[PDB]
Amino acid sequence: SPPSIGIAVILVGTSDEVAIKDAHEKDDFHHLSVVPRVELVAMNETDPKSIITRICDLMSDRKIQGVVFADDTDQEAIAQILDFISAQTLTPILGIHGGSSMIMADKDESSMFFQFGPSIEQQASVMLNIMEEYDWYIFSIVTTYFPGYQDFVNKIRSTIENSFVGWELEEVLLLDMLKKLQSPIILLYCTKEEATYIFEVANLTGYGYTWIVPSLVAGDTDTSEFPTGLISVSYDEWDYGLPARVRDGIAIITTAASDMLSEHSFIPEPKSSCYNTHEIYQSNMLNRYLINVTFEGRDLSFSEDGYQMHPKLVIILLERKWERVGKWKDKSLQM
Amino acid sequence: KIVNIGAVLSTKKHEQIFREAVNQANKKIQLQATSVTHRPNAIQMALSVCEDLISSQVYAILVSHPPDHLTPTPISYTAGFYRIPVIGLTTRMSIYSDKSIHLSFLRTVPPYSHQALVWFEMMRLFNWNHVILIVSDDHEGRAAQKKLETLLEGPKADKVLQFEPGTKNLTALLLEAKELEARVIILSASEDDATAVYKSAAMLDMTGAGYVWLVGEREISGSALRYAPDGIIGLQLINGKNESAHISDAVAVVAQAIHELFEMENITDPPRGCVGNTNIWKTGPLFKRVLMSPDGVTGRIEFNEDGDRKFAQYSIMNLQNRKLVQVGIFNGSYIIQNDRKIIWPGG
């Protein structure tokens, strides 16, 4: 009875295709108005032409309703390409791992690309909640001109402006790539390449002062200048494996399509191909269902700008040695 | 070594100039030209950059937006996988200034947001210390708001009112401008958005004497000029839409920069095609750092921190008797008035 929709689960150097197959192939999406017909594609070539000529060919052979993309790189240019793909075929893509999940604020108005990951404002909120836990109400901020810079500073200053407790923001600095100032708790915000040059001063650090940067600085946690005792916000890349995310992305596409058909009595006609175009209203309706998918009680909603509303975030300490020391679900910190 | 420099230009007439510009630029390395036209379907344009440009080991791609619907995004993203420097020549929308999305982009034209830099001076030239800023809830409009705000911050004078793009009836907003005792009004919208404001303002008597309409280039362009109010002041980028002069200038730029880059050491060869090359051009970021860090056909050629063009003049325009007049010119710092007299709305 329930119609089948075609979801492409594309894995770029993303072993193992077996654990990913078996995990989802027991989820009975009946009790939904729509059930998914999943076709994995294992690829080794991660360039713009290969990714494009994979998506488009899959669209022209099979009826592709959704695409779920997982990656094994730290290349953000992946995400933009797929968000560029999303918009020109008005077909949903979910970047769930790797560069496909490297959050891309400010993207195409027509886009249906959504990423498993948090915003700059969300992790800033987690930082200030860490302080609210252990009473570090005196801090600074030190920022580069790298984008999202102000949005970060804006989020910090906002959450404490609209408050009664005694927050004391010392000094807010904006490096170029040089002055000295003494605050016990800081908030560094920059690129991991520029962070090392900034971290190269008084290896300011190492005595009685903690430093706290997000995923933008921690970067590839499995990869000199960085302080010991650095605390970071990052996405849960330890207890949330690729099978679990492929399966979650499937559930999101399938539930969105189902809710649309149970209300509008039709789901979008899959896209003819990439080459042809001619023969928008269907895309935006599904987009509305895509960003408000409640599954297993768990709220898997998205922002209209492409990040998750409630990402599984973790607070990590820096031997090697980034180690999880806290978890964040909804608006609380269990550390 | 042969160093080829790629281009995505308007028609064959312009690709001709580009190969001629490379020709008159070779005066150890030889520069050769590889050029294509735009592909109206942008997915195929992304594949054309792979198969016709990067397949030739390109060291930089230049991209002209023709006089709509063709953006440099397919070339920026594809070349932006590696970081082969992409030098836009025509498009001015500020989405291309965000370095966290467009990873190797320079452009010999200022973005539209930078036109706020002129209105600032108009205010400092007319003692306008209280403005109402009407902008579209769009990346470009808020780009104007953001830069006008920061250069005002030395934003009480800035009273912003937002409208959703595609809004035909704007009586509510402008009614609120009336309630806010509006005098000088700055507007940042698209062509067909500015048209909507223009008609809504000429129907509650908001274009007459006492009102000052200060406006950029898109709002005094195309459809919007026909219904733009009598007395409005617009802007116009000098040598802006002249694709030739920008090809010539940017070819001179990449030439000098190729020389400076080979003066350095350990410069690798760019990728040869997309399929198989999953890694990044190692000496790419350094090459663009060279490009961002002379004199030319369009003017003092120099870029800011984002790769956007610095030191550009604007034709300052006033709409006299339903016709655009140049009442002045924006040096690049000071703003200079010519012989013609200015007429405000109403007179």
Instruction: Give the CATH number of the domain where residue A127 resides.
Output: 3.40.50.2300
Sign of CA dihedral B259, B261, B263, B267: negative
- Domain span(s) for CATH 3.40.50.2300 in chain B: 1-110+244-312, 111-243+313-347
One domain for residues A322 and A175: yes
Q: What is the CATH number of domain B1-110+244-312?
A: 3.40.50.2300
One domain for residues A316 and A190: yes
Cα B98 to Cα B326: distance, rounded to the nearest angstrom: 32
Chain A to chain B Cβ contacts (< 8 Å): 81
One domain for residues A286 and A161: no
One domain for residues A149 and A239: no
One domain for residues A74 and A199: no
> From the list A45, A47, A56, which residue is nearest B81 (CB)?
A47
| Count of domains observed in chain A | 2
Query: According to the annotation, is A264 in a ligand binding site?
Result: no
Contact B43 A146 (CB under 8 A): no
Q: What is the CATH number of domain B111-243+313-347?
A: 3.40.50.2300
Cis peptide leading into residue A16 (ω within 30°)? yes
Query: According to the annotation, is A200 in a ligand binding site?
Result: no
φ and ψ at residue B105, rounded to 5 degrees: -110, 125
Contact A80 B43 (CB under 8 A): no
One domain for residues A41 and A99: yes
**B65 close to B71: Cβ distance less than 8 angstroms:** yes
Residues 6+ apart with CB under 8 A from B339: none
List, in sequence order, every residue forming a beta bridge with B185; answer none if it has no partner: B132, B213
Cis peptide leading into residue A321 (ω within 30°)? yes
**A107 close to A279: Cβ distance less than 8 angstroms:** no
* Residue type for position B285: P
For residue B5, CA distances in Å to A163, B53, B257, B281, B291 come to 56, 8, 12, 15, 14
φ and ψ at residue B204, rounded to 5 degrees: -120, 15
The DSSP secondary-structure symbol of B210 reads: T
One domain for residues A54 and A132: no
Q: Which two tokens stand for residue A294?
A: 């409640």
Structure-solving method? X-ray
State how far residue A176 is from chain B, nearest Cα, in angstroms.
Answer: 10
Q: Is B286 on the interface with A (CB under 8 A)?
A: no
For residue B209, CA distances in Å to B81, B160, B170, B230 come to 53, 22, 21, 10
Q: Which two tokens stand for residue A221?
A: 């946690």
Helix locations, B103-167, DSSP H: 116-126, 139-152
Sign of CA dihedral B325, B330, B331, B334: positive
One domain for residues A26 and A106: yes
Helix locations, A223-264, DSSP H: 242-264
Degrees, nearest 5: CA angle A191-A194-A196: 110
State how far residue B277 is from chain A, nearest Cα, in angstroms.
Answer: 7
For residue A190, CA distances in Å to A74, A169, A193, A219, B216 come to 16, 19, 8, 11, 34
One domain for residues A272 and A185: no
- Residues of B in Cβ contact (< 8 Å) with A148: 100
One domain for residues A213 and A335: yes
**A126 close to A142: Cβ distance less than 8 angstroms:** no
One domain for residues A281 and A255: yes
Residues 6+ apart with CB under 8 A from B306: B97, B98, B99
Contact B305 A145 (CB under 8 A): yes
Q: Is B73 on the interface with A (CB under 8 A)?
A: yes
One domain for residues A8 and A136: no
State how far residue A147 is from chain B, nearest Cα, in angstroms.
Answer: 6
Cα A43 to Cα A75: distance, rounded to the nearest angstrom: 16
Cα A33 to Cα A259: distance, rounded to the nearest angstrom: 7
Q: Which two tokens stand for residue A88?
A: 């020109």
For residue A244, the enclosing domain spans: 1-117+235-311
- Residues of A in Cβ contact (< 8 Å) with B103: 76-77
φ and ψ at residue B33, rounded to 5 degrees: -100, 135
B191 CB neighbour count, 10 Å cutoff: 15
Tokens 């989820």, located at residue: A27
